[PDB]
């Protein structure tokens, strides 16, 4: 019913119609997560190469 905020230009136009009213981690922490996972990979690869050594 109520049309408001009509803004016209050459490219087109825009408006708003109402029908009814109402009723972060740091760089440190990130580098810590990535390096922590890298250690786990290193540990796993070490256990393998140790197992293969046996």
């Amino acid at each position: 019913m109520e049309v408001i905020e009509l803004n016209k230009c050459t490219s087109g136009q825009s408006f708003e119609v109402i029908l009814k009213p109402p009723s972060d981690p740091s760089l440190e922490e990130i580098q810590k997560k990535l390096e922590a996972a890298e250690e786990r990979r290193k540990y796993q690869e070490a256990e393998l190469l140790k197992h293969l050594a046996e």
Binding site: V3, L19, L34, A37, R40, R41
Partner: protein, 437 residues
């Protein structure tokens, strides 16, 4: 004028990026060699299209965009594609081996050895900006790169660009065009890590795009090309306000303002119409009322769900072509009395409308026919949560047996992150419930 940088991650992001930037060039009359005749301000300017294109003294208009993929295959086709002259080498980053559909491999393993390079190449674009708004990130949920490396990137951008907004164009996984069985894992994992780092994310279910291409374009088996050229039209509709003169959604902050009241719930449902086949001999042009009425048909949504059994928090209508406010209001009035449209009690029941007199441009030789008027409705409805339910169920089925989990743990990830991510999704489904019912 404020600039926007577009980041394309993974196969889906890159190939869609190709579809969008191709379309962008045709809409702005930019040629494959980057020359834009209509631009009389040679070597610079602060026009609306400069939001997406920077200019060189040689009169070339280059996309403010970066392409990244842990595999060189896909981007190599950009390097040798038709729009090869458009981008410059520093914008196209490629790795040696992909993430093998593994989130942990793309995030932790391979992500760690290239993240600093990407951010550096991104910083080189940001340095050419006078007032950077934020970033538009294109990627997939299923891919190892699309899911893994994206989340890592999104985390760093929130650190290096804390005041900047970040919008998402994400591809929701569909078995009809799947590339892995573990896509549900990658989807939950990347959503959880990215959620706090994304202001507004537009999900596109390939299932929805796939059936639209089959139903309306009469393509028996849609290729990625068929899917992308359609998605690019939707993306174009959403980003047109940032590239053209207007007063609605003129910047990235206005997206969150007009579509996202609650921060976590920042996944607006997109609905586009009309989709007509190019090789359809006889077509009767559809009216404003007809295309607008189709915005409430689930068969035209980017995600298949039922808005009737949910609640709206916001709703934007974005028209392109022969449309005037009078015909729009007349269409809304009619539709309101015929369809179920429930807004949450703490929001006004209304529609923010945007019109661009220039009708939707079509790729020459494409599958889409030229139309006199088109529309894209961006509605933040709680009904989109059906997609989360689907996905979280598929996740629970596999994880109960810890299937495929060893591949992720083997990359340095912890089995706990699976449950940590799934718990965040469980909370998300609840937030949708409280608001919806």
């Amino acid at each position: 004028m404020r600039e926007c940088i577009s980041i394309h991650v993974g196969q889906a992001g890159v190939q869609i990026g190709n579809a969008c930037w191709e379309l962008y060039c045709l809409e702005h009359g930019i040629q494959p060699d980057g020359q834009m005749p209509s631009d009389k301000t040679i070597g610079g300017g602060d026009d609306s299209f400069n939001t997406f294109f920077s200019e060189t003294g040689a009169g070339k208009h280059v996309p403010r965009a970066v392409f990244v993929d842990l595999e060189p295959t896909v981007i190599d086709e950009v390097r040798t594609g038709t729009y090869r002259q458009l981008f410059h080498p520093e914008q196209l980053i490629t790795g040696k081996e992909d993430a093998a559909n593994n989130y942990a491999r793309g995030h932790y393993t391979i992500g760690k050895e290239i993240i600093d390079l990407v951010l550096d190449r991104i910083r080189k674009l940001a340095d050419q900006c006078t007032g950077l708004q934020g970033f538009l990130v294109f990627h997939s949920f299923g891919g190892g790169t699309g899911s893994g490396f994206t989340s890592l990137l999104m985390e760093r951008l929130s650190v290096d660009y804390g005041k900047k907004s970040k919008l998402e164009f994400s591809i929701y996984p569909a078995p009809q065009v799947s590339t892995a069985v573990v896509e549900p894992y990658n989807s939950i994992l990347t959503t959880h890590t990215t959620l706090e780092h994304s202001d507004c994310a537009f999900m596109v279910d390939n299932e929805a795009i796939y059936d639209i291409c089959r139903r309306n374009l009469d393509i028996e088996r849609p290729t990625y090309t068929n899917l992308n050229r359609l998605i690019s039209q939707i993306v174009s509709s959403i980003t047109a306000s940032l590239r053209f003169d207007g007063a609605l959604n003129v910047d990235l902050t206005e997206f969150q303002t007009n579509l996202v009241p609650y921060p976590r719930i920042h996944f607006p449902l997109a609905t586009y119409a009309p989709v007509i086949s190019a090789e359809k001999a006889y077509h009767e042009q559809l009216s404003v009322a007809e295309i607008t009425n189709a915005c409430f048909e689930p068969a035209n949504q980017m995600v298949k769900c039922d808005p009737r059994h949910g609640k709206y928090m916001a709703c934007c209508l974005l028209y392109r072509g022969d449309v005037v406010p009078k015909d729009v209001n007349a269409a809304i009035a009619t539709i309101k009395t015929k369809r179920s449209i429930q807004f949450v009690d703490w929001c006004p029941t209304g529609f923010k409308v945007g019109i661009n007199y220039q009708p939707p441009t079509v790729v020459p030789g494409g599958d889409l026919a030229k139309v006199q008027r088109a529309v894209c409705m961006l509605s933040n409805t709680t009904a989109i949560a059906e997609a989360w339910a689907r996905l979280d169920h598929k996740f629970d089925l596999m994880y109960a047996k810890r299937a495929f989990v060893h591949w992720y743990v083997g990359e340095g990830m912890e089995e706990g992150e699976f449950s940590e991510a799934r718990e965040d999704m469980a909370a998300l489904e609840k937030d949708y419930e409280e608001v919806g019912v």
